[PDB]
Amino acid sequence: GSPPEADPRLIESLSQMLSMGFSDEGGWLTRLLQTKNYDIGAALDTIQYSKH
């Protein structure tokens, strides 16, 4: 079996964020990937919030 509707690539990116120390205000650690096209690397800049 191999349903393309499992989003198995989100857990991967979510896995690296699990060892990061991120937040989840709007529970984005799960939807972020979905919203930021799993670009946690690019989202990292928004997920690590380094602006002032």
Written as one letter, the residue type at 34 is Q
Q: Give the structural domain span for 42.
A: 1-52
Q: Do residues 40 and 47 touch, judged by C-beta distance below 8 A?
A: yes
d(CA 15, CA 50): 21
Contact partners, residue 46, CB within 8 Å, separation at least 6: 36
Q: What is the number of domains present in the chain? A: 1
Written as one letter, the residue type at 16 is Q
- For tokens 């529970």, the residue is 27
d(CA 15, CA 29): 10
d(CA 24, CA 6): 21
Q: Do residues 36 and 17 touch, judged by C-beta distance below 8 A?
A: no
The domain spanning residue 18 has which CATH number?
1.10.8.10
The CA–CA distances, whole Å, from 20 to 2, 3, 5, 16, 23 equal 29, 29, 26, 6, 10
